[PDB]
Amino acid sequence: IDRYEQVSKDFEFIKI
Amino acid sequence: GFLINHYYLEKNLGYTFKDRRYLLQALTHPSYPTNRITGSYQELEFIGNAILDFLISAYIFENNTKMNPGALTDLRSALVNNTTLACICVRHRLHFFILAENAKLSEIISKFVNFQESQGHRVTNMSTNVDVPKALGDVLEALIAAVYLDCRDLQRTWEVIFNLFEPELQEFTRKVPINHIRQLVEHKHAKPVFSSPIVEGETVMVSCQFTCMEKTIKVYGFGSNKDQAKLSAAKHALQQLSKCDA
Amino acid sequence: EDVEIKPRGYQLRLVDHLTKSNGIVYLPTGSGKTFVAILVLKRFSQDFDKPIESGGKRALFMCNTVELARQQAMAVRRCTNFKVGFYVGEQGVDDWTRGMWSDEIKKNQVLVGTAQVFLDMVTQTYVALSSLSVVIIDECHHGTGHHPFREFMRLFTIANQTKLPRVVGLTGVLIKGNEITNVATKLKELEITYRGNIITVSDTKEMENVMLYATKPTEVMVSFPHQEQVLTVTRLISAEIEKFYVSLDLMNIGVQPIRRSKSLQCLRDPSKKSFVKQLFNDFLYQMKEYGIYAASIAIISLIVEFDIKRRQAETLSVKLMHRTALTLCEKIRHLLVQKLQDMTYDDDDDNVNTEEVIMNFSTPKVQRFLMSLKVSFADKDPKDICCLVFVERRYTCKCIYGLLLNYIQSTPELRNVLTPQFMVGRNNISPDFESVLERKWQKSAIQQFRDGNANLMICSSVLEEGIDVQACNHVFILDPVKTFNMYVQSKGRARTTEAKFVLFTADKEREKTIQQIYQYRKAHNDIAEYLKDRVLEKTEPELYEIKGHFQDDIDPFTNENGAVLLPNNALAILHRYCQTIPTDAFGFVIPWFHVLQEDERDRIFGVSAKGKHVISINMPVNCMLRDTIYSDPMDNVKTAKISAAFKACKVLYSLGELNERFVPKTLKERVASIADVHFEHWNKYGDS
Amino acid sequence: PFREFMRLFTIANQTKLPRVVGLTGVLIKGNEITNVATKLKELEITYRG
Amino acid sequence: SIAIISLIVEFDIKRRQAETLSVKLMHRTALTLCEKIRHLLVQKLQDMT
RNA sequence: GAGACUUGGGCAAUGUGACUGCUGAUCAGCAGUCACAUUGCCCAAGUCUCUU
Ligand SMILES: Nc1ncnc2c1ncn2[C@@H]1O[C@H](COP(=O)(O)OP(=O)(O)O)[C@@H](O)[C@H]1O
Ligand SMILES: [Mg+2]
């Protein structure tokens, strides 16, 4: 893949 | 079956074993699980130490009259020292028949035997050698008690001991056997002083500060442990003093 | 401290009840249960002052590990005014004779230490169960299986059954492992193991509200997509590693002790080869799990470990092996650094370049982790932040510590607020990256964490429990939660107000983790309801099941003088005696076991030999037990080994090698035996 | 063959689908009776009822 | 006793559907062993009759 | 006996669901013993020098 695909820059903490 | 080609050992040693069990027990190092029929060689070397020391002390008492006891004790201590026993055991090719197994001890034995081959199987009179295997002299000394118990006669055992020690006897009786280290300290001009040695892995060193021919020289020597590093420094100091004398 | 310590509303009733009857306490961590334990110790001090024979007594405080024992020792010393004796195995009480044990026994009012030391010194007739006032247990949930707590408890069954010392257990978690199923039977087994009744908070409004100052942290979770493609250089590295494996197994060192399966069923690789292969496989797992940059961090640790091992490698062949391993690791490092620098060409802003390189070659999980850290710390003050992170592998700790070091150096916001530091279990790995003892240091990582030097810690379950730590506010878990005990103990650490509990899982694993989290919450709840509504019985006075708990093993054998031998300690006693025989390096002292064969089994034993297995013991030629000893026929190999060791040590004791107090005899016993025979004439001269 | 049969439902047409109904006197087969809710969950979702 | 009686019919019928002499002799030996066992067990039975 | 159908019996193949023990490999956490190393307290002991 040469470069690891980037995760979502925006992400929040879901509550269990 | 344990004693492969034991006739070679007997021919080199010169004695014959009516019972081979004593030889097996004497050759049984504590690290040898495959021998369930005899005990280790400690219970034979315990007696053999006394046998050897008393026999050789009596011989030198009877024969080497023309010398004071203050040096006769040094002669007997040198002739009973484990290093000389290891050298003698190397000379008679007894390393082959030692029913022993170990990782580092076998390496030590191999290094010592090739070093002695380099020296020609003669005492280096004390050795700057890496390290001396105690178990080698131990098994050689134990097989003396093994020989004795196989016959229960002191005379035959003494004949064997003398046949093994003829070169050592003729050498130590003529030349001064050993003092070493101390004679460097008390020497006429050599005044060695030392620091504290440190071991690391399988290497060691010590900073030797001594004097020679009215100068001051620093020497270093290969060895194995702190005190034996100091021993190597003493050996090289002796070498420098002898060469300057030469 | 001083006397300004004022008991709360639940501690007073707890100690009041514990005075009346034996019982186990179950309170959340940080609820001051050790303080009420101290107060309990302050109600059983009547016999502390007087000597043993005059009628005085002492008390034993119990611990599982050395460090917790020491910490609680200082705690009780500063909280009370008693001579608190602290003793552990490494302290040097191993060679303590009768007199220099008696002095310590008579110069203290309460004893603390590990389980093995206390259990042994009780079995060595130094003190008797009747000679004790109260015994306090902490982390009582460890009392299962062959654990030393249960072994010590069995002494209560074998010893006197009257004027028996009190037992109290301290804990905040009751179950150890994934046996959440059928909590009631586990609770009953815990009840009977410590012959007590668990007592727990009951009166809601007045008292659980007060106790809840150990607030429950808020819990959140973040999911990330799986990374599936595997980099090309990885398979090249794997090929080099596998051919290195082939060469290593092909190359020849001298004779080495034979290490085989734990059930003696088949062979295994030599310990050094297994060790180096374990290093390489662990590093490979690091690489696939955490990408290339983390692999670049871990390869340096492998380099330094291999160099240290080669330095301490006594044999030249082992040095050659470690040298070859170092060469392969160096080649791997060269390839890894080349690949890492392969992308650095395009950008030339060193701090931002390093930051984006970290983001770029990292696994998505670690990327999410670092972005979560950035958005959580939010460039705040460094003094207030004190956060924890849990990872499973030991080397993962050091690798992620290095990664955080580099990343914090790669962000100005985090460069001044985070001070990373890591620590692992007892099998410690050097925190260096260059050479052994790069600098001499005197502060433990835990202490630096406590003094604010390190606001961020990386650790396995080593820092889970026991060791006292201030109320944390942010806790992170990267590797998946493994058990119930570690989850609940970790969530207990985040004690401060609005504390944040954080854990991470992959996209395709979130749904599974839902069941574990809900099951753990239900397991915490149903305990509360069941203990709140349990049957009102006094002290589990069912002696029949008490003696029916342990009888299924080999009955422990006791001789005269009151000494008692524990069958589960037979292996330890036998190995310890073996170590007493002087030997060189490879000269083995461990008794080489051997499992019998069925045809030989009924060739030596009866018809029952076919049904169940037997193991045989052989002894090194130096030991006088030349004749082999055949174990009693047991079912599994474990009980076979236990019976073999028990019978062998019994034979040793009968032969007199093992002393009266069940310990191998030194030369002191030999000279004591010889003295009045060969050296009587010294006494008439006033010596001996 | 129960869920083997019902896996046809997803791959085949998901609309105008025949009614499915589960009949039983017991719900759990085996010693995995623990956490009955989660084990009944896959029973619910496997039989789309 | 009843178990060893039951074994006889299964062994005999297995020998009946047995194909060649190699398994015929095996079933014959098994039946001889079974009958010897049955006789020993009925001696045990009649010892206290 | 065969062709087919009805019922039953015999054999075989393969698969499915569940249970009890037995081990294997890997990983974390904990205890104990032995040994080595650092320097010091350190007395014994011989040698040697000074000298007592
Ligand atoms: N009633 C109280 N009186 C005095 N100190 C208390 C009281 N309750 C709690 N504490 C203090 O709070 C701290 C709680 O930590 P600790 O008791 O070690 O937690 P745990 O016992 O749950 O491991 C103790 O050091 C204790 O001194
Ligand atoms: Mg506490």
Numbering used by the authors:
A (entry chain B): 344 to 359
B (entry chain A): 1428 to 1552, 1602 to 1722
C (entry chain A): 2 to 689
D (entry chain F): 149 to 197
E (entry chain F): 297 to 345
Passage from the reporting paper:
To capture the different steps during the translocation of Dcr-2–Loqs-PD along the dsRNA, we used cryo-EM to analyse the sample of Dcr-2DDNN–Loqs-PD in complex with the dsRNA substrate under conditions with ATP and Mg2+. Through single-particle classification, we captured two representative cryo-EM structures of Dcr-2–Loqs-PD in complex with the dsRNA substrate in translocation states. We captured another structure in the mid-translocation state, in which about 17 bp of a dsRNA duplex threads through the helicase domain further towards the catalytic centre of Dcr-2. When superimposed onto structures of the initial binding and early translocation states, the cap–core modules sway back about 2 Å towards the dsRNA. Importantly, in the mid-translocation state, the C-terminal dsRBD of Dcr-2 appears in the map and interacts with the dsRNA substrate, resulting in further bending of the axis of the dsRNA about 25°, and the trajectory of the dsRNA is directly towards the PAZ domain. During the translocation, the interactions between the DUF283 domain and RIIIDa/b domains, including relatively flexible interactions between the DUF283 and RIIIDb/RIIIDbi domains, and relatively rigid interactions between the DUF283 domain and RIIIDa through the DP-linker domain, remain almost the same as in the initial binding state. This suggests that the overall domain configuration of Dcr-2 is relatively rigid during the translocation process until the dsRNA terminus reaches the Platform–PAZ domains. A comparison of the cryo-EM structures of the early- and mid-translocation states also demonstrates a very similar structure in their helicase domains, of which the ATP-hydrolytic pockets have an EM density for either ATP or ADP-Mg2+. Moreover, DUF283 interacts with RIIIDb and RIIIDa, blocking the access of dsRNA to the catalytic centre of RIIIDa/b and preventing non-specific cleavage of dsRNA during the translocation.
